[PDB]
């Protein structure tokens, strides 16, 4: 009679629905029967449930009867009940929604319902249906009048942003939490959330101290939970215990590389965690002053906690910029306060950053992160970065130096950033923009601020410079720069700077130019003067470069110049000194008979060197560069020979020395290709025309 | 113009010494002309530092005797005692750093620098009306100017350094500094030629480093002179002192305020010297004053007494007192809500709540009072938690206080008969005097 009982129950529910008393409360008893029956489509009939005090007494009975309801929900969590989930969920929703209006002491029933809800929280996304159900469940529950268990419930209602398909439902629910489901002006939920967040921010010292991707769960809970309190965090920030615990936590998480437009370090080996962390620090745009101040503190505190705080500050200001949207009835910050904060942080960064190999790359990390911070400051504060140009120009420009890849790369990026944010168009062009600042700054630095290595800033501004149309102003300072390590001329960091600026001016005048004449004159003058030093081949390099550039209209300067120069060289030259020979080859640009006699004396001296390859090829190329009319040097070369062979000054020098028929060198000894010796032919042929 | 060659000739003569007559003549002549200032600027430093070095570090203790007719050391000093303003101090410091020997001119170097300070210590401040320069230069100049004390015995610290620094090591030097900032302040005040704030700005940058390392010498020995020099119809004095306390470098802004309120005489004079806007114009100062209110406590019985006193005094025309009241009460409700700070800060914010509760008389006594009363009582109920009665104690006393100054009619009187005699209101540790304080 299973079909008989089935049809009986079905037609009974049908007759109910066709038709619809105190004793009707005993109705719920059959609902108890309906709660654990054969359950084809059982619970349907229960839907006949629904100045309503009658409804209120029915709800009293139903509060007594929700025991079997929660039992069946847990059974669905254990037994199949793969579709009755939504049924019982909506049943509980309707029931618990039917009573919170007034005259509801119900504290005992309240605690019982809180126990039941804590039990029911054991359901989380069995399929699309279970998640979809729990969504509306939390929606209706948290929207009720007042309770105290929702501290747990609301928690999972925020961490529900991790599903596969229903994420839009959770998002639109959080959207709905704008004026009705509020953090708002209901202190109870707020303080319960604060109490939660406190233990949260006390755990992360340990939570991320374990395996990966489980920490993401906790950090995601964190980021969502903050996203709840869009505004109204100053109501929980203000407590000193909160800020202390949160700061001390975050200091240890961030302390394995980073990139440009934040990534953490040791024991955080996954990158999406780092993106979520920089999104959660960026989450703070409630108040600025408190945050920036309490973190500047942590920077000033010690050494091992610095880089973390720097990255923090970068994330904080970038968050203060503004790219998603939260509860949109609140207010935003002000540009002028941004100006104050950026001025402060930039001044501290610049003044603090100008200088155990572990500690050395540590300082490298420090300067790199500070440069990146300047870059982010430019990026966020794009427009109003104009009142404080120079404050950012000078530090990194002088820092644009030794470390090309890392340091100078981040530098270049920061400068093109301030360009594209302020319209400065290829940072080289920024030198062609306001420059007198740089001129006077470098000048007064080298003039008063002597004892400090301001060596490479001039290199960056003159060798990597733009067009030299500004050197006519720089000239005197250049001249001063020339006199710089030439008046006292007793300082290692000044003589090295003199050699540096020499190489730089040589390169610039080489490219930029083709005034400059006398510039190169005094340049070579001072260079040759200092050439008498020890291990200063830079003098030879600068000499070669200048001399190459100084041979356009060098009427008499070059003459006595090279005279005294080769004098001192012969005094000194007696392994890369052939570069001066290259300079001599550069001297071969416009050399004369004076250089001929000089090279004659040079060959006479080099004759002392034996007839003994690297050095053989060096001397070979040196002879072959110009070969300034060798007559006695002809015989010297005459008394394997690729250069002396390729000489080809005449058809009588090596040809006579080509009667060997030997083993090895003879193969190349008889390698004459063309004769072209018909001079007398045409000479006499002149007698066949006229 | 041609003097530059003489300059060369000077350093020539200076580098070709033993020619007593020639060097005496050239040095006295150069002193004679120690309107174009450009070459006088190159002379002012670029000849000043070379002659200084080669005449102090290069010459042996026999130049003074080459021509002992009471003029050689005279011109030596008169080069370094006056003349060009800035570079003198700079090269002096740089040398005494580099020139660190047992004694060659060391004692005489100290005599030189001291005798310079003693007479005309301004020498830079008054000539601060400058256009602009490089920032690391400012850095070195100010840091030296304010660390001179510790910088001195580093190079030579011993019995001789002790007798050098047994009269003025601290406790006199910063006294000088304070005296000098006094003089230059009053000078730029009575000037009234062109409003500089440049000397003001520079001496404020001074006050910065001074406060951040020097702890408390200048506070009284500045404010009492400031009190005096402001108490009259001191238009220029008051305005310049305002602009001085204002543009203090925001980097610290905290030691300045901490000291300025700590040793100050009373609320009235503190309110007179700072300025009505200095707390309502520089938002960093908002943050300082009200973080001292909320976050920390230093002495707080007379200290925060005076601090909140000045808060109210300044708020004689600022409708900011109600906002700070609301925020204070909200923080009280949160700290009573959340796992709380230790008892010190608890008593601290308590006393703060009382003193700010002093001022009243306005509408809106409907809802703020409701939230405060309800939150406080609901917390104090369970606050003891069989854990530490003092915390509970705290609440109940402010109960009376809030009862006194929430709606003084009806139920509070019942409190006066129920929660004032049989409610543990017997201890006299710090209950009676703050209770009386509650009466404003």
Short mmCIF file of N, CA, C and O in Angstrom, two decimals, chain A residues 239-314:
data_model
loop_
_atom_site.label_atom_id
_atom_site.label_comp_id
_atom_site.label_asym_id
_atom_site.label_seq_id
_atom_site.Cartn_x
_atom_site.Cartn_y
_atom_site.Cartn_z
N UNK A 239 41.73 52.92 19.00
CA UNK A 239 42.22 52.19 20.15
C UNK A 239 43.67 51.79 19.92
O UNK A 239 44.00 51.19 18.90
N UNK A 240 44.53 52.11 20.89
CA UNK A 240 45.96 51.96 20.69
C UNK A 240 46.35 50.49 20.57
O UNK A 240 47.29 50.15 19.84
N UNK A 241 45.65 49.60 21.27
CA UNK A 241 45.96 48.18 21.18
C UNK A 241 45.78 47.68 19.76
O UNK A 241 46.60 46.89 19.26
N UNK A 242 44.72 48.12 19.10
CA UNK A 242 44.49 47.72 17.71
C UNK A 242 45.68 48.07 16.84
O UNK A 242 46.27 47.20 16.18
N UNK A 243 46.04 49.36 16.80
CA UNK A 243 47.12 49.81 15.93
C UNK A 243 48.42 49.10 16.27
O UNK A 243 49.16 48.67 15.38
N UNK A 244 48.72 48.97 17.56
CA UNK A 244 49.96 48.30 17.95
C UNK A 244 50.00 46.87 17.42
O UNK A 244 50.97 46.47 16.77
N UNK A 245 48.94 46.10 17.66
CA UNK A 245 48.94 44.70 17.23
C UNK A 245 49.01 44.58 15.72
O UNK A 245 49.78 43.77 15.19
N UNK A 246 48.24 45.41 15.01
CA UNK A 246 48.20 45.32 13.55
C UNK A 246 49.55 45.66 12.95
O UNK A 246 50.06 44.95 12.07
N UNK A 247 50.15 46.76 13.40
CA UNK A 247 51.47 47.15 12.92
C UNK A 247 52.49 46.05 13.18
O UNK A 247 53.21 45.63 12.27
N UNK A 248 52.59 45.60 14.44
CA UNK A 248 53.59 44.60 14.76
C UNK A 248 53.39 43.33 13.95
O UNK A 248 54.37 42.67 13.57
N UNK A 249 52.14 42.98 13.65
CA UNK A 249 51.89 41.85 12.77
C UNK A 249 52.47 42.10 11.39
O UNK A 249 53.37 41.39 10.93
N UNK A 250 51.97 43.14 10.72
CA UNK A 250 52.35 43.38 9.33
C UNK A 250 53.85 43.52 9.16
O UNK A 250 54.38 43.24 8.08
N UNK A 251 54.56 43.97 10.20
CA UNK A 251 56.00 44.15 10.05
C UNK A 251 56.68 42.82 9.75
O UNK A 251 57.66 42.77 8.99
N UNK A 252 56.15 41.72 10.28
CA UNK A 252 56.81 40.42 10.13
C UNK A 252 56.38 39.67 8.89
O UNK A 252 57.12 38.79 8.43
N UNK A 253 55.20 39.97 8.34
CA UNK A 253 54.75 39.28 7.14
C UNK A 253 55.61 39.68 5.95
O UNK A 253 56.14 38.82 5.24
N UNK A 254 55.76 40.98 5.72
CA UNK A 254 56.50 41.47 4.57
C UNK A 254 57.99 41.14 4.62
O UNK A 254 58.68 41.37 3.63
N UNK A 255 58.49 40.61 5.73
CA UNK A 255 59.90 40.27 5.82
C UNK A 255 60.10 38.82 6.25
O UNK A 255 60.26 38.53 7.44
N UNK A 256 61.76 35.79 -3.78
CA UNK A 256 61.63 36.90 -2.84
C UNK A 256 62.10 38.20 -3.48
O UNK A 256 63.09 38.78 -3.06
N UNK A 257 61.37 38.65 -4.50
CA UNK A 257 61.76 39.82 -5.27
C UNK A 257 60.55 40.72 -5.42
O UNK A 257 59.52 40.52 -4.78
N UNK A 258 60.68 41.72 -6.29
CA UNK A 258 59.60 42.67 -6.54
C UNK A 258 59.74 43.22 -7.95
O UNK A 258 60.79 43.10 -8.58
N UNK A 259 58.67 43.84 -8.42
CA UNK A 259 58.62 44.42 -9.76
C UNK A 259 57.97 45.79 -9.66
O UNK A 259 57.62 46.26 -8.57
N UNK A 260 57.80 46.44 -10.80
CA UNK A 260 57.24 47.78 -10.85
C UNK A 260 55.72 47.71 -10.84
O UNK A 260 55.12 46.66 -10.59
N UNK A 261 55.07 48.84 -11.10
CA UNK A 261 53.61 48.90 -11.16
C UNK A 261 53.08 48.07 -12.31
O UNK A 261 53.31 48.38 -13.48
N UNK A 262 52.53 45.17 -4.71
CA UNK A 262 53.78 45.04 -3.98
C UNK A 262 54.01 43.60 -3.54
O UNK A 262 53.09 42.93 -3.07
N UNK A 263 55.25 43.14 -3.69
CA UNK A 263 55.62 41.77 -3.40
C UNK A 263 56.42 41.69 -2.10
O UNK A 263 57.20 42.60 -1.79
N UNK A 264 56.21 40.62 -1.36
CA UNK A 264 56.85 40.42 -0.07
C UNK A 264 58.14 39.61 -0.25
O UNK A 264 58.67 39.49 -1.36
N UNK A 265 58.65 39.06 0.84
CA UNK A 265 59.98 38.47 0.92
C UNK A 265 59.85 37.15 1.67
O UNK A 265 58.76 36.57 1.75
N UNK A 266 60.97 36.67 2.21
CA UNK A 266 61.11 35.34 2.82
C UNK A 266 59.87 34.86 3.56
O UNK A 266 59.28 35.59 4.36
N UNK A 267 59.48 33.61 3.28
CA UNK A 267 58.35 32.90 3.87
C UNK A 267 57.00 33.40 3.37
O UNK A 267 56.00 33.33 4.09
N UNK A 268 56.95 33.91 2.14
CA UNK A 268 55.68 34.28 1.49
C UNK A 268 55.72 33.90 0.01
O UNK A 268 55.38 34.69 -0.86
N UNK A 269 56.14 32.67 -0.28
CA UNK A 269 56.64 32.30 -1.60
C UNK A 269 55.65 32.38 -2.76
O UNK A 269 56.02 32.08 -3.90
N UNK A 270 54.40 32.78 -2.51
CA UNK A 270 53.42 32.92 -3.58
C UNK A 270 53.12 34.39 -3.83
O UNK A 270 53.18 35.20 -2.91
N UNK A 271 52.80 34.72 -5.08
CA UNK A 271 52.71 36.12 -5.49
C UNK A 271 51.30 36.70 -5.36
O UNK A 271 51.15 37.89 -5.07
N UNK A 272 50.26 35.89 -5.59
CA UNK A 272 48.91 36.40 -5.44
C UNK A 272 48.63 36.84 -4.01
O UNK A 272 47.89 37.79 -3.78
N UNK A 273 49.22 36.14 -3.04
CA UNK A 273 49.19 36.62 -1.66
C UNK A 273 49.71 38.04 -1.56
O UNK A 273 49.13 38.88 -0.86
N UNK A 274 50.79 38.33 -2.28
CA UNK A 274 51.40 39.65 -2.19
C UNK A 274 50.52 40.70 -2.85
O UNK A 274 50.41 41.83 -2.36
N UNK A 275 49.89 40.35 -3.97
CA UNK A 275 48.96 41.28 -4.59
C UNK A 275 47.77 41.55 -3.68
O UNK A 275 47.31 42.69 -3.56
N UNK A 276 47.28 40.52 -3.00
CA UNK A 276 46.18 40.72 -2.06
C UNK A 276 46.62 41.58 -0.88
O UNK A 276 45.84 42.40 -0.37
N UNK A 277 47.87 41.43 -0.45
CA UNK A 277 48.36 42.22 0.67
C UNK A 277 48.47 43.69 0.29
O UNK A 277 48.06 44.57 1.05
N UNK A 278 49.04 43.97 -0.88
CA UNK A 278 49.11 45.36 -1.31
C UNK A 278 47.72 45.91 -1.60
O UNK A 278 47.51 47.13 -1.54
N UNK A 279 46.76 45.04 -1.89
CA UNK A 279 45.39 45.51 -2.05
C UNK A 279 44.73 45.77 -0.70
O UNK A 279 43.79 46.57 -0.62
N UNK A 280 45.20 45.12 0.36
CA UNK A 280 44.63 45.33 1.69
C UNK A 280 45.26 46.51 2.41
O UNK A 280 44.56 47.20 3.16
N UNK A 281 46.55 46.77 2.21
CA UNK A 281 47.13 48.02 2.69
C UNK A 281 46.54 49.20 1.94
O UNK A 281 46.20 50.22 2.54
N UNK A 282 46.43 49.07 0.62
CA UNK A 282 45.69 50.05 -0.17
C UNK A 282 44.24 50.15 0.28
O UNK A 282 43.60 51.17 0.03
N UNK A 283 43.72 49.11 0.94
CA UNK A 283 42.37 49.19 1.46
C UNK A 283 42.17 50.33 2.43
O UNK A 283 41.06 50.86 2.55
N UNK A 284 43.23 50.73 3.12
CA UNK A 284 43.16 51.82 4.08
C UNK A 284 43.11 53.15 3.34
O UNK A 284 44.14 53.69 2.94
N UNK A 285 41.91 53.68 3.14
CA UNK A 285 41.76 55.08 2.77
C UNK A 285 40.63 55.69 3.59
O UNK A 285 39.79 56.44 3.09
N UNK A 286 40.62 55.38 4.88
CA UNK A 286 39.74 56.05 5.83
C UNK A 286 40.37 57.29 6.41
O UNK A 286 39.82 58.39 6.30
N UNK A 287 41.54 57.14 7.04
CA UNK A 287 42.32 58.28 7.53
C UNK A 287 43.78 58.05 7.18
O UNK A 287 44.24 56.91 7.09
N UNK A 288 44.50 59.16 6.98
CA UNK A 288 45.89 59.11 6.56
C UNK A 288 46.86 59.46 7.68
O UNK A 288 47.77 58.68 7.98
N UNK A 289 46.68 60.63 8.31
CA UNK A 289 47.67 61.17 9.23
C UNK A 289 48.07 60.14 10.29
O UNK A 289 49.27 59.92 10.52
N UNK A 290 47.09 59.53 10.95
CA UNK A 290 47.39 58.52 11.95
C UNK A 290 48.28 57.42 11.38
O UNK A 290 49.29 57.05 11.97
N UNK A 291 47.91 56.91 10.20
CA UNK A 291 48.64 55.79 9.62
C UNK A 291 50.06 56.20 9.27
O UNK A 291 51.03 55.57 9.70
N UNK A 292 50.20 57.25 8.46
CA UNK A 292 51.53 57.66 8.02
C UNK A 292 52.41 57.99 9.22
O UNK A 292 53.60 57.67 9.23
N UNK A 293 51.83 58.58 10.26
CA UNK A 293 52.63 58.94 11.43
C UNK A 293 53.08 57.70 12.19
O UNK A 293 54.27 57.53 12.49
N UNK A 294 52.13 56.82 12.53
CA UNK A 294 52.49 55.62 13.27
C UNK A 294 53.44 54.73 12.49
O UNK A 294 54.12 53.90 13.09
N UNK A 295 53.51 54.90 11.18
CA UNK A 295 54.44 54.07 10.43
C UNK A 295 55.78 54.75 10.19
O UNK A 295 56.81 54.06 10.16
N UNK A 296 55.80 56.07 10.03
CA UNK A 296 57.07 56.78 10.09
C UNK A 296 57.78 56.48 11.39
O UNK A 296 59.01 56.36 11.42
N UNK A 297 57.02 56.37 12.48
CA UNK A 297 57.61 55.94 13.74
C UNK A 297 58.35 54.62 13.57
O UNK A 297 59.56 54.53 13.84
N UNK A 298 57.64 53.59 13.11
CA UNK A 298 58.25 52.27 12.96
C UNK A 298 59.46 52.30 12.04
O UNK A 298 60.36 51.48 12.19
N UNK A 299 59.48 53.22 11.08
CA UNK A 299 60.68 53.38 10.27
C UNK A 299 61.83 53.93 11.10
O UNK A 299 62.94 53.38 11.08
N UNK A 300 61.58 55.01 11.83
CA UNK A 300 62.63 55.61 12.63
C UNK A 300 63.11 54.69 13.74
O UNK A 300 64.20 54.93 14.29
N UNK A 301 62.35 53.66 14.09
CA UNK A 301 62.66 52.88 15.28
C UNK A 301 64.03 52.23 15.20
O UNK A 301 64.94 52.56 15.97
N UNK A 302 64.21 51.31 14.26
CA UNK A 302 65.41 50.48 14.22
C UNK A 302 65.82 50.31 12.76
O UNK A 302 65.36 51.03 11.87
N UNK A 303 66.71 49.35 12.52
CA UNK A 303 67.25 49.11 11.19
C UNK A 303 66.57 47.92 10.52
O UNK A 303 66.29 47.96 9.32
N UNK A 304 66.30 46.86 11.28
CA UNK A 304 65.79 45.63 10.68
C UNK A 304 64.33 45.76 10.28
O UNK A 304 63.83 44.96 9.49
N UNK A 305 63.63 46.77 10.79
CA UNK A 305 62.22 46.97 10.48
C UNK A 305 61.99 48.10 9.49
O UNK A 305 60.88 48.62 9.40
N UNK A 306 63.02 48.49 8.74
CA UNK A 306 62.90 49.66 7.88
C UNK A 306 62.20 49.34 6.57
O UNK A 306 61.14 49.90 6.27
N UNK A 307 62.79 48.44 5.77
CA UNK A 307 62.30 48.20 4.42
C UNK A 307 60.82 47.84 4.42
O UNK A 307 60.06 48.27 3.54
N UNK A 308 60.40 47.05 5.41
CA UNK A 308 58.98 46.74 5.55
C UNK A 308 58.16 48.01 5.64
O UNK A 308 57.19 48.19 4.89
N UNK A 309 58.53 48.91 6.55
CA UNK A 309 57.78 50.14 6.74
C UNK A 309 57.78 50.99 5.48
O UNK A 309 56.78 51.64 5.16
N UNK A 310 58.90 51.01 4.76
CA UNK A 310 58.94 51.77 3.51
C UNK A 310 57.89 51.26 2.53
O UNK A 310 57.11 52.04 1.97
N UNK A 311 57.87 49.94 2.33
CA UNK A 311 56.88 49.36 1.42
C UNK A 311 55.47 49.64 1.91
O UNK A 311 54.57 49.94 1.12
N UNK A 312 55.27 49.55 3.22
CA UNK A 312 53.98 49.92 3.82
C UNK A 312 53.58 51.30 3.36
O UNK A 312 52.52 51.49 2.75
N UNK A 313 54.44 52.29 3.62
CA UNK A 313 54.12 53.69 3.32
C UNK A 313 53.77 53.87 1.85
O UNK A 313 52.84 54.61 1.51
N UNK A 314 54.53 53.23 0.97
CA UNK A 314 54.20 53.30 -0.45
C UNK A 314 52.79 52.79 -0.70
O UNK A 314 51.98 53.46 -1.37
#
